[PDB]
Design an enzyme around this catalytic site. Sequence first.
Site, mmCIF file in Angstrom:
data_model
loop_
_atom_site.group_PDB
_atom_site.id
_atom_site.type_symbol
_atom_site.label_atom_id
_atom_site.label_comp_id
_atom_site.label_asym_id
_atom_site.label_seq_id
_atom_site.Cartn_x
_atom_site.Cartn_y
_atom_site.Cartn_z
ATOM 1 N N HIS A 1 51.483 40.794 41.242
ATOM 2 C CA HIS A 1 51.926 40.243 42.526
ATOM 3 C C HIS A 1 50.964 39.219 43.149
ATOM 4 O O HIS A 1 51.384 38.488 44.048
ATOM 5 C CB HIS A 1 52.212 41.385 43.510
ATOM 6 C CG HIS A 1 50.983 42.117 43.979
ATOM 7 N ND1 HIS A 1 50.293 43.090 43.256
ATOM 8 C CD2 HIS A 1 50.351 41.912 45.168
ATOM 9 C CE1 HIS A 1 49.272 43.469 44.041
ATOM 10 N NE2 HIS A 1 49.277 42.773 45.186
ATOM 11 N N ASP B 1 53.456 46.393 37.766
ATOM 12 C CA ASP B 1 52.847 45.318 38.558
ATOM 13 C C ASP B 1 51.503 44.857 37.988
ATOM 14 O O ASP B 1 50.529 44.655 38.707
ATOM 15 C CB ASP B 1 52.829 45.657 40.057
ATOM 16 C CG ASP B 1 54.233 45.944 40.592
ATOM 17 O OD1 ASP B 1 55.213 45.358 40.081
ATOM 18 O OD2 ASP B 1 54.354 46.748 41.541
ATOM 19 N N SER C 1 43.045 43.527 46.744
ATOM 20 C CA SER C 1 43.721 43.759 45.463
ATOM 21 C C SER C 1 42.778 43.686 44.263
ATOM 22 O O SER C 1 41.713 43.063 44.314
ATOM 23 C CB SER C 1 44.813 42.712 45.251
ATOM 24 O OG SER C 1 45.991 43.357 44.846
#
EC number: 3.4.21.90
Lengths: 151, 151
Positions: free
Chosen positions: A29, A51, A103
Amino acid sequence: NDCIFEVKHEGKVTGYACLVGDKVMKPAHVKGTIDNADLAKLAFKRSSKYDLECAQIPVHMKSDASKFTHEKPEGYYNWHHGAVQYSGGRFTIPTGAGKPGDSGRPIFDNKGRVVAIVLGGANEGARTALSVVTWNKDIVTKITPEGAEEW
Amino acid sequence: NDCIFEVKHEGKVTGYACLVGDKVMKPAHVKGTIDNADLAKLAFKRSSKYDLECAQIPVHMKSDASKFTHEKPEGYYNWHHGAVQYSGGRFTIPTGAGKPGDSGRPIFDNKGRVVAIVLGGANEGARTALSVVTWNKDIVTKITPEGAEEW
């Protein structure tokens, strides 16, 4: 402690891509491309269910690849913002210790080997859980609490 | 621990060969023939699956041969250029210990018995990866990383 290698994307706090065992891996993402021209020309594979986006590490630099394990006993593990708790399978931060941009951070055990990669999390104060990926030795798996958002 | 026995090829820096258990073993890619005439006149078997050659040790000198094991736990190991390690399912050295001409050296465990033989490698400073042969339970195998070359 900081005996670590990773790299960011497109000149923002776009999360990190991480050298684990024998392959580069990245959240699927997170936007843009790697701020290292040596890895940027690699042909990444991807999944929209884990993901996760990944490529083989080039032979000439495999010393930069971190150690890894499937082993996850309960206790405490370490990442970019220090210690994170792991009990009941919910990787948990004791309130607010992360936000969007956090992230791709690997989670390292007390012997410095990667067990998981962070993707996001769900606020419940001291009970704030993380969305992560981790490998059950043969196979990658995705963990996600209800009510999460991406980082 | 210098309790080791070996031989070289054509009397020059041309790689090496080992006495293990009850059989001589040697690489297939090295030029020439064994230096010691009482070994060199023997009949040798070979395999391109393992880049390897072998013969039975003469009974008068069988007592001079080194011991072996199949065991490969993570940790540190002994060989003629030092600093050899097993981790992440790979043998490794720092670059300065290994190069062309040094092929056919045995790697020994902490109790002084052979676990593997060096054929070659893929270079990096802190952790060069190695091409090697080793025994699993009671069958021989070849291990080789990405991008290696024989020495």
